Design a protein around this motif. Structure first.
Motif, PDB file in Angstrom:
ATOM      1  N   UNK C   3      10.963  13.888   2.459  1.00  0.00           N
ATOM      2  CA  UNK C   3      10.101  12.836   1.928  1.00  0.00           C
ATOM      3  C   UNK C   3      10.424  11.510   2.617  1.00  0.00           C
ATOM      4  N   UNK C   5       9.679   7.182   2.381  1.00  0.00           N
ATOM      5  CA  UNK C   5       9.183   6.057   1.612  1.00  0.00           C
ATOM      6  C   UNK C   5       8.776   4.948   2.569  1.00  0.00           C
ATOM      7  N   UNK C   6       7.490   4.672   2.738  1.00  0.00           N
ATOM      8  CA  UNK C   6       7.088   3.498   3.513  1.00  0.00           C
ATOM      9  C   UNK C   6       7.555   2.189   2.894  1.00  0.00           C
ATOM     10  N   UNK C  13       9.670   3.685   7.796  1.00  0.00           N
ATOM     11  CA  UNK C  13       9.797   4.490   6.584  1.00  0.00           C
ATOM     12  C   UNK C  13      11.264   4.846   6.370  1.00  0.00           C
ATOM     13  N   UNK C  89       3.314  14.731   9.304  1.00  0.00           N
ATOM     14  CA  UNK C  89       3.532  14.017   8.059  1.00  0.00           C
ATOM     15  C   UNK C  89       2.215  13.917   7.311  1.00  0.00           C
ATOM     16  N   UNK C  90       2.309  13.918   5.987  1.00  0.00           N
ATOM     17  CA  UNK C  90       1.144  13.878   5.129  1.00  0.00           C
ATOM     18  C   UNK C  90       1.351  12.872   4.026  1.00  0.00           C
ATOM     19  N   UNK C  91       0.293  12.138   3.720  1.00  0.00           N
ATOM     20  CA  UNK C  91       0.318  11.232   2.590  1.00  0.00           C
ATOM     21  C   UNK C  91       0.096  12.058   1.344  1.00  0.00           C
ATOM     22  N   UNK C  92       1.097  12.052   0.470  1.00  0.00           N
ATOM     23  CA  UNK C  92       1.029  12.749  -0.798  1.00  0.00           C
ATOM     24  C   UNK C  92       1.781  11.958  -1.864  1.00  0.00           C
ATOM     25  N   UNK C  93       1.128  11.710  -2.999  1.00  0.00           N
ATOM     26  CA  UNK C  93       1.805  11.237  -4.216  1.00  0.00           C
ATOM     27  C   UNK C  93       2.567   9.931  -3.975  1.00  0.00           C
ATOM     28  N   UNK C  94       1.860   8.976  -3.361  1.00  0.00           N
ATOM     29  CA  UNK C  94       2.360   7.659  -3.032  1.00  0.00           C
ATOM     30  C   UNK C  94       3.277   7.558  -1.836  1.00  0.00           C
ATOM     31  N   UNK C  95       3.806   8.663  -1.330  1.00  0.00           N
ATOM     32  CA  UNK C  95       4.742   8.598  -0.217  1.00  0.00           C
ATOM     33  C   UNK C  95       4.248   9.538   0.879  1.00  0.00           C
ATOM     34  N   UNK C  96       5.152   9.832   1.806  1.00  0.00           N
ATOM     35  CA  UNK C  96       4.924  10.647   2.984  1.00  0.00           C
ATOM     36  C   UNK C  96       5.834  11.859   2.884  1.00  0.00           C
TER      37      UNK C  96
END
Lengths: 116, 112, 112, 116
Positions: C3, C5-6, C13, C89-96
Motif C-alpha cells: 500500500x 500513501x500519497x 508516496x 499501481x491502482x487507486x483504491x480506498x483513498x490510497x494506492x
C-alpha cells in the motif's frame, strides 16, 4: 489530459472536464469558499449509491429517510480496458507537481449523464 | 453538528448538509469513485468567482470562453483572516466537523 | 501487495513497507495526528533534491541555508512519463495499492 | 506561520517545521518520488501508537510481530488551550490556495522529540 481533485473523507475525485450550461435535479451539498462564504458550486447527488451517498448517510442519518432519489440512476463512465498508474473509471494517471492528471480527456470516454 | 469534506487544491469544503429535491443550472463536473465508473453525483458551478471556478480556469483555460455563468451569484452563507464562514470547525478523522448545524445559518442559495 | 500513501502537494508516496530498527541522519519533520499532540513518527529528509525537499524550500526559504544535506544520495528504488517506479499501481480506498511487494524490488537505502 | 501537508489514508499531516541535522532510530517507510524513484525521505516510526502505526498494522500484519519499537516513546507537542479553524496539536489554521497554514510556528510550541 484531464485533471482530478481528490475529495477528503471519500474515495472520489472531481473530474475537471466541464459540461457547460446543463441542468440537474438532485440533492445538493453547498461548496463554501473558506475565505468568503460565497457558494460558487454544489455537489448534486443524483442517485443513492456511491461514495458521496455513503459518506452522507453516515454524516446525516436522516437523509436516507427524507430523500426522493433513486437507489441508482445509471449515470456512469465506462472504465477503460487495461506498468502504469491506474484509476479504474478513467485509466492511466500521473502525478504532476503533486497534482493528478490522466492520459485521456474524460469528455472522450463513453459516459451517460443526466443530460444525455 | 455538520461534517465538511475539504476539496484538494482549493480553499473550499463540501457541507454535508443536504437540500433535497432541488434543481440548479450551471456547469457540471462528474465526481468519480476510484473503484467504479458509476457516477452518483456532480459538482455544479453556479458563479465564475468561487474557488472551484478559479481552479478550473487554471486547469481548463478554454472553459472561460465556453461558460455562460455570471461573474457572481449572491449564493453565500453568513457566519454569526482566521475566521470560518460557519463558525467553529475542527479537524477530526480526515475531515472537518463544525460546532453548528449548517441549516441554522443564514444562507442564500439558487432556490432561495 | 504493498500500500502507498500519497502526500499532498508533492508527487511522492509513502511505501508501507517497513525496514525495522534502522538509524538515519537527516532533517526531521514531525507527523501530527489531527486528534492528539502525540508524535509517533517523523519524516526524515536525506537528499536536497527529493520532492519533499523542494516543497520545503517553497514553504521554508531559510531551510536551504541551515541544512547540511547533500544535493543527492543514491537512495532510490529501481522498477523491473506514465511509468511508476514500482510497477503497476491502482487507486483504491483513498490510497494506492501496487501489484508487487516493495521488498522484492532493487532499492538502495541509507543503510544499504 | 507553519504549513502542513495532509497524508492520504491517515488523519495525519507532515509539519513543515524542520529540525536540522538530527539522528533518529525507528522503523522506516521510504518516500518515493513518482517521477524518478529517488528516495529523498523516510517516515520514521518511533513508537507503536498513532495513526501511521495503525495504518501500518492494517497494511502489514507482520510488522507488529517483527518490530522492536515501544508502544509509546512520549514524543509529543503540547496542544494549545482554545470562531476559528482548530487543529488540536497546533491550534489556529487557515486554507490558503487550498494549502494549510497555522497561525503559530511549530518550533515555538512545547514539544519533546527523540533528540530532546
Amino acid at each position: 489530459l484531464t485533471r482530478y481533485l481528490p475529495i477528503s473523507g471519500v474515495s472520489s475525485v472531481v473530474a475537471l472536464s466541464p459540461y457547460v450550461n446543463k441542468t440537474i435535479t438532485g440533492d445538493c451539498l453547498p461548496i463554501l469558499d473558506m475565505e468568503t462564504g460565497n457558494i460558487g458550486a454544489y455537489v448534486v447527488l443524483v442517485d443513492q449509491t456511491g461514495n458521496m451517498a455513503t459518506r452522507l448517510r453516515a454524516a446525516v442519518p436522516g437523509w436516507s429517510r427524507r430523500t426522493l432519489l433513486p437507489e441508482t440512476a445509471g449515470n456512469h463512465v465506462t472504465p477503460p480496458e487495461y506498468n502504469s498508474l491506474w484509476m479504474t473509471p478513467v485509466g492511466n494517471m500521473l502525478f504532476d507537481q503533486g497534482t493528478l492528471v490522466g492520459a485521456l480527456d474524460f469528455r472522450s470516454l463513453r459516459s451517460r449523464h443526466p443530460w444525455s
